[PDB]
RNA sequence: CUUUAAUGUUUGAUGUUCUAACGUUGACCCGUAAUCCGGGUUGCGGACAGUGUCUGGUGGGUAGUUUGACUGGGGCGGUC
RNA sequence: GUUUAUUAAAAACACAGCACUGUGCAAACACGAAAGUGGACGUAUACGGUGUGACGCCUGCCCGGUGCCGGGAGGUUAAU
RNA sequence: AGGACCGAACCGACUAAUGUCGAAAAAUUAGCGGAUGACUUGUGGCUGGGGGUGAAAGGCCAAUCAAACCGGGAGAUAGCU
């Protein structure tokens, strides 16, 4: 299928390039999200009028307001106390529920799903590192030290 | 010697009563042939 | 029933035929499918039960037109 | 107990008695009670789906709490009670905060017994936690399926898992069929053995104890003619056919399982 | 041409990971005095399962049929 | 105890018990073009199928053939 | 306590005789089995024909069952009387 695409593809993205693609990948990822357009005939005219550098800038001030997002908040460290058991055996599991309403409180006001644990759910009690992805090139790394109770 | 037909008036209207056959489209077909025949009595009325 | 919201395929009976010829009454049934497409002039997603014909159709014309001939058709979706 | 009672007559001769003593002797507990109508194993299409299903006493249903969901609220033990629709006891239990629920009895209860749920709970039996806190090696019952399904696994009497092993966020448990499954280490779990251990030792003794416990007699598809069985026909007891079912799939040794999509939960099959 | 190797091409099998299709007879909220159904949030599986078209195997579970004539009755045997 | 209402009441059928086999729960299986329902508001000390038929002594040898279960060296093998 | 014992109602039908254009399209008379249970019964529901139901006889499904009844294809076909 050849689609003109907006947002940075990691692969194949070069901003409105005709390029086939999966009609799966377009029709279930692309298209919903924006990243794309459906063109055939009628909005390549359109494309290169309109979109060709208008929305360029558009789209990069977004990358720029992410990029400030994420340097809100220099420290990067999150201390949350949590009642765990006696020589570890944490109470329970947490994920991105408390740690992100906790951050939202005090620091950094993001999504619930920019959130992304590559270390699993915070089973064992101790310093761990959370990867946060504000941008598909644009990677942070904040280090969160759970505090037994 | 306890034959076939015991009769039951409640039973008896609730199998073959006017609204048992008004209530399923072969129901209503058997009234529209029995019209359609002329009969006097298109169902067993209590 | 098994008929397709966007091109209208239903269900068709045909025979199958062996290698002595002999015939028994089958019924070819449409590739049907149950999928969401988001619709950004209403902003939500639509589940429509479409055959993979009639979701090749949607991606060759736009999903907005397939719905307003869908409306104008008379049927809910 | 088991009692062996005396061959006064026949059909007591063989009679084999499970007597529990600390059984409550009195009606149960009302508001957590229900209507159990029969079916006699008939759909909603009023045809026998299951054979040999039919009559039996009236019995009443009680709402048996499998979820367990009463988080930090310490329980007390009123009472044990039998229970018609399952092999194994349930037990009264009433919360420190007012509120009566039945439960599984596992074989250690008693009346008075102090049960805990949630993950600050001990390790008593009795007490419900999450599989991820439950010590390895230790026997469960009553274990769940996914996270607040209620609990399917081991719920008849004197019956229970093992759990071997604990991998990621997936455990592994041993069902008392031999076969290993894999589960979410969120599921919960109670700790001990379900009770009643000694209900497989009765023999009901008679043709009528069958009967008035829900079973209908079983024929045999020899008996039959061969219009209603595949197999039956011929004068004195032929049969010269390989066993099946009565809608002709090969039985006595033929494997049924045909899932595809639960087989990444399967470690092992039965042996 | 026989004998071998750097980058790029078609690639297909296999393996790992992801989520956005799809499944959910998991939980929670709303329509709603509703164990149906739908929508929303989340969890778990996840391109698997499942379904359509085509195709191999199995298939008395079911169906339609066939199972010759002569003959010192017929059958058996023999013959055509 | 049940059975050929209306020529067969029995050694037939059932039976408690016994064994084999299938089934991990969206269970196997059954009725349904499907939804759904029974199994079961049960989940392996449970459920379905099959044979035998209380209880006591027991139940031997044979895997060639046909089923069923497992294997993959090699050969043959459809659609495409 | 008991699918315990004897025995009426009640349920069933082992034997004999009568009756076979009968009082009766399975009965009567004299005996006979069970009779607190796998019992029996009233009322009302559910299962529909290649289907139901069946402690299994090819039994029963309105006096009709190795495929009910009614209408239709239909004036089926009949090398036979």
Redesign the interface.
């Known amino acids: 299928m050849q689609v003109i695409l907006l947002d940075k593809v990691a692969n194949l993205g070069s901003l409105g390039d005709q390029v086939n693609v999966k009609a799966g990948y377009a029709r279930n990822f692309l298209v919903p999200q924006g990243k794309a357009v459906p063109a055939t005939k009628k909005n390549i005219e359109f494309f290169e009028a309109r979109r060709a550098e208008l929305e360029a800038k558009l789209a990069e001030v977004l990358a720029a307001a992410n990029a400030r997002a994420e340097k809100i908040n220099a420290l990067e460290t999150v201390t949350i106390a949590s009642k765990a ?1 006696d020589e570890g ?1 944490l ?3 947490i994920g991105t529920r408390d740690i992100a309403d906790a951050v939202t409180a005090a620091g950094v006001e993001v999504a619930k799903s920019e959130v992304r644990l590559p270390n ?2 915070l089973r064992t009690t101790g310093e761990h590192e959370v990867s946060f992805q504000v941008h598909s090139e644009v990677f942070a790394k904040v280090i969160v030290n759970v505090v037994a109770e | 010697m306890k034959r076939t037909f015991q009769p039951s008036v409640l039973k008896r209207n609730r199998s073959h009563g006017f609204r048992a056959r008004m209530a399923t489209k072969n129901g209503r077909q058997v009234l529209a042939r029995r019209r359609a025949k002329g009969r006097a009595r298109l169902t067993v009325s209590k | 029933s098994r008929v397709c919201q966007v091109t209208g395929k239903r269900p068709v009976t045909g025979n199958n035929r062996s290698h002595a010829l002999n015939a028994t009454k089958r019924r070819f049934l449409p590739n049907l499918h149950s999928h969401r497409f988001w619709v950004e002039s209403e902003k939500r997603f639509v589940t429509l039960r479409v055959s993979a014909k009639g979701m090749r159709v949607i991606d060759k014309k736009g999903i907005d037109t397939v719905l307003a001939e869908l409306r104008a058709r008379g049927e809910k979706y | 107990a088991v009692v062996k009672c005396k061959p006064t007559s026949p059909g007591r001769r063989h009679v084999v008695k499970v007597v529990n003593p600390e059984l409550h002797k009195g009606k149960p507990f009302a508001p957590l009670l229900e209507k159990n109508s029969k079916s006699g194993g008939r759909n909603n299409n009023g045809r026998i789906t299951t054979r040999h299903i039919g009559g039996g006493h009236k019995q009443a249903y009680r709402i048996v709490d499998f979820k367990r969901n009463k988080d930090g609220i310490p329980a007390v033990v009123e009472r044990l009670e039998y229970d018609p629709n399952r092999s194994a006891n349930i037990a009264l239990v009433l919360y420190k905060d007012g509120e009566r629920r039945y439960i599984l009895a596992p074989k250690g209860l008693k009346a008075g017994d102090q049960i805990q749920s949630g ?2 709970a001990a390790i008593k039996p009795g007490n419900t936690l ?1 599989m ?2 439950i010590p390895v090696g230790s026997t469960v019952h009553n274990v769940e399926m996914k996270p607040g399904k209620g609990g399917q696994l081991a719920r008849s009497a004197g019956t229970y898992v093992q759990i071997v092993a604990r991998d990621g ?1 997936y455990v592994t448990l041993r069902l008392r069929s031999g076969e290993m499954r894999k589960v979410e280490a ?1 599921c919960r779990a109670t700790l001990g053995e379900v009770g009643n251990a000694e209900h497989m030792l009765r023999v009901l003794g008679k043709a009528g104890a069958a009967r008035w416990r829900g079973v209908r007699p079983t024929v045999r598809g020899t008996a039959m003619n061969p219009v209603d069985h595949p197999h039956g026909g011929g004068e004195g007891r032929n049969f010269g056919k390989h066993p099946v079912t009565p809608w002709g799939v090969q039985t006595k040794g033929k494997k049924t399982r045909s899932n595809k999509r639960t087989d990444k939960f399967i470690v092992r099959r039965r042996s």
């Open positions: 058991g055996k109470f329970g599991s699993g759910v | 993950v600050d999450p991820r806190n966020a969120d």
